[PDB]
């Protein structure tokens, strides 16, 4: 089947991880409260009553880890910098142990000679942030933000040449602040009663609008003052599914083509256009900030590359609705479509562990063209694609480690992308696996197993490789 012969010269092949799911040792070192270690510590909030404050322990592990990557011939990792372990109260003193670790784990890579691929802010804002101004709703973020890249880019940038400077900001924007289930947990309390404070109408704009400008804020000190030194690069990971027509009418087939503007265009629209896409400014109106023209100078054109993190596939339908009122206005609503895996009863795909994952290989090929084709051909990284097992106590270790569906998964999507690439000419660069090992899923928590490897929650965190283990380095063999 594939091989590294299937993809270009050069093609980047890693795992990824994220500093909160992964690193625990939450109060080691000096490290800052964030809104997620609020998050997991709120009743409620996690649906197996769980806490990272251990999480894999990575924090420890790493370099056991690292020579796991290095057992199947892994070209790179993604991981992300908990923003509180190097200003635990997001702006202020520099916490010098923060950066001796990143610099340990760093160095620990590329003497195995794997590529860091550093992600700046994967969700862990320091509390003192959402604290003094409610974090990413107000501008302040902007420049705070900025100031901890920065610090990032003088201290890593050195031997750090891929940077992604926010991952998921869509989903940030409608779990954190539309459907509140996601730190800080904010929504309109009409709509949703488990939530404290918010507005599921306003919010996620002002959030993305935040997103977006610390971004280009990010990128405009990169470089004016880093780059031409340093010699890297700056992109975002963009959580992207891809939308199919519920029926091929010109309605549902306009209807797709909104909803993808309304999850990858809110964001991707500012960086290579300037603003964003006509159909949100029709329907969200007032509720959608405006970009100064000095604003979108420094926006449009801030992203090297393109980093997609890609799932699966729903249908889209029209919808028409006629709200009652201001008080239930949601981003759902204003997209005017309704999205979801099943068309005429029957579910587009096999499902994996996670309610909202199904596996549509063909999506992978058809979300990089519109990316070519919308935005002119950009480079782009695949910087998560793949899937979930249960956490199944009534099984023993070694039949879960019989992960034959994921490697079904990564084997379709991955053909899919190589068709992408060879036969439609979309210029992808890289591919990384969610994730290197099991680990906490967010609000899933442990009940959520993504890993290449994994891990006995009830053998101080043993790693086991499942059987995609073996695929991948026979996939990577030179
Ligand atoms: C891509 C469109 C799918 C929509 C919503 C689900 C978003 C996935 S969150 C994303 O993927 C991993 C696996 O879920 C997380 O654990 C990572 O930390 C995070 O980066």
Same mark, same amino acid.
């Given at each position: ?78 991981? !992300? ?30 003497? =195995? ?54 991952? /998921? ?29 918010? #507005? ?94 000095? /604003? ?23 919808? #028409? ?7 239930? %206005? ?13 068309? %005429? ?50 099984? !023993?270790?070694?039949?879960?480690? =019989?992960? !034959? ?10 053909? #899919? ?22 680990? $906490? ?29 073996? $695929?991948?380095?026979?996939?990577? =063999?030179?």
């Amino acid at each position: 089947g594939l091989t590294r012969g299937s993809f270009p010269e050069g093609f980047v092949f890693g795992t990824a991880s994220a500093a909160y799911q992964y690193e625990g040792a939450v109060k080691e070192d000096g490290r800052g409260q964030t809104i997620w270690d609020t998050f997991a510590h709120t009743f409620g909030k996690i649906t197996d009553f769980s806490n990272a404050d251990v999480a894999v322990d990575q924090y420890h592990r790493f370099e056991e880890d690292i020579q796991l990557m290095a057992d199947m011939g892994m070209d790179a990792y993604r991981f !992300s910098i908990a923003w509180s372990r190097i200003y635990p109260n997001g702006v202020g003193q520099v916490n010098q142990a923060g950066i001796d670790h990143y610099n340990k784990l760093i160095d620990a890579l590329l003497a =195995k000679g794997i590529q860091p691929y550093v992600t700046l802010y994967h969700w862990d804002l320091p509390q003192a942030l959402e604290d003094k101004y409610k974090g990413w709703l107000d501008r302040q973020i902007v420049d705070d933000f900025a100031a901890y890249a920065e610090t990032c880019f003088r201290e890593f940038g050195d031997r750090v040449k891929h940077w992604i400077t926010l991952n /998921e900001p869509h989903t940030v924007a409608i779990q954190g602040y539309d459907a509140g289930l996601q730190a800080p947990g904010r929504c309109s309390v009409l709509l949703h009663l488990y939530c404290k404070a918010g #507005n599921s109408g306003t919010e996620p704009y002002v959030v993305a609008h935040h997103f977006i400008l610390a971004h280009a804020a990010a990128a405009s000190i990169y470089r004016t003052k880093y780059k031409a030194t340093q010699n890297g690069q700056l992109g975002i990971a963009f959580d992207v599914m891809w939308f199919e027509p519920m029926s091929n009418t010109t309605i549902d087939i306009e209807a797709a083509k909104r909803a993808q503007e309304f999850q990858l265009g809110w964001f991707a629209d500012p960086f290579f256009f300037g603003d964003y896409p006509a159909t949100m400014r029709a329907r969200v109106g007032e509720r959608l900030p405006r970009f100064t023209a000095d /604003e979108a100078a420094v926006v449009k054109g801030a992203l090297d590359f393109v980093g997609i993190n890609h799932y699966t596939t729903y249908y889209t339908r029209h919808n #028409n609705t006629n709200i009652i009122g201001t008080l239930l %206005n949601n981003t759902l609503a204003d997209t005017g479509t309704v999205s979801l895996p099943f068309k %005429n009863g029957k579910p587009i795909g096999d499902r994996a562990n996670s309610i909202w994952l199904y596996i549509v290989p063909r999506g992978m090929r058809s979300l990089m063209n519109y990316v070519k084709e919308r935005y002119n051909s950009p480079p782009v990284y695949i910087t998560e694609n793949g899937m979930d097992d249960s956490n199944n106590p009534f099984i !023993s270790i070694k039949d879960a480690l =019989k992960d !034959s569906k994921r490697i079904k998964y990564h084997n379709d999507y991955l053909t #899919n992308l190589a068709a992408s690439i060879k036969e439609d000419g979309c210029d992808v660069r890289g591919y990384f696996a969610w994730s290197l090992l099991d680990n $906490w899923e967010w609000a899933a928590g442990y009940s959520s197993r993504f890993g290449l490897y994994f891990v006995d929650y009830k053998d101080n965190l043993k790693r086991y490789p499942k059987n995609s283990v073996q $695929w991948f380095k026979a996939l990577l =063999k030179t």
